[PDB]
Design a protein around this nucleic acid. Structure first.
Ligand code: CL
Ligand code: CL
Ligand code: MN
Ligand code: MN
Length: 191
DNA sequence: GCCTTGCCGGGTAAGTTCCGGCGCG
DNA sequence: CGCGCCGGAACTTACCCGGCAAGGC
């Protein structure tokens, strides 16, 4: 499914560089936000926003995509109870992702929280349970990896992908045409 | 000879929840 | 009155990045 793949990709970005927020305001007012932030304006507008917009249209979500410029980064934001729960329930059921969704999610998580040099293959996150799920998926895909506490200070774990399986990881996972290619993977393929 | 990877410090790119406003039953 | 989109941004915790050296083949 094209929509489930894009969805899993976006969830990867949300988990890695954004979030899902249920806000309560003065006067019993409220808001539900789907958020992805990124320093690069181009990435948010040229790569991420069009995918989100496709999803919004497919799901008949009436809300608009907002791009807010902040001091340190751009924010892509959709204010939508419907889209919020769509992603929050998907995240709840993450262990049940099929292979396609797994790969889309890993791509997204990597763009957001991965080692972009690709000299080493690493993903940082404070959620060990999350990295452990990804570890299992990678193993099933034949990509060896380890999880260690990379930063004792702030308690951020790292998922290190064995360079023995660099080709398999990059070609089979980052470069799968089953769903949107991460920018650096698209570049490699077009050379 | 060199690759790999745990480990750790460097200079910062994300995240999180406020605010005032509007719309609508 | 009770909720849910919009637009902005202040505030908080950094961001992944990259060097080093131990191990192992
Ligand atoms: Cl990438
Ligand atoms: Cl509304
Ligand atoms: Mn990021
Ligand atoms: Mn953070």
């Amino acid at each position: 499914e094209n929509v489930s793949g894009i969805s899993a990709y976006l969830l990867g970005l949300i988990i890695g560089d954004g979030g899902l927020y249920k806000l309560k305001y003065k006067g019993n007012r409220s808001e539900y936000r789907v958020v992805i932030t990124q320093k690069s304006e181009n990435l948010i507008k040229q790569h991420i926003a069009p995918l989100m917009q496709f999803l919004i249209d497919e799901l008949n979500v009436k809300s608009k995509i907002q791009i807010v410029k902040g001091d340190t980064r751009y924010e892509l934001r959709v204010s939508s109870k419907k889209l919020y729960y769509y992603f929050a329930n998907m995240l709840e059921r993450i262990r049940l992702f099929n292979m396609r969704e797994q790969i889309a999610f890993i791509k997204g998580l990597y763009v957001a929280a991965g080692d972009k040099t690709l000299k080493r293959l690493r993903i940082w996150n404070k959620n060990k349970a999350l990295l452990e799920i990804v570890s299992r998926w990678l193993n099933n895909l034949g990509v060896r990896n380890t999880i260690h506490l990379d930063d004792h200070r702030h308690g951020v774990y790292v998922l290190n992908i064995s360079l023995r399986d660099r080709i398999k990881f990059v070609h089979t996972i980052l470069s799968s045409h089953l769903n949107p290619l991460p920018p650096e993977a698209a570049a490699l393929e077009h050379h």
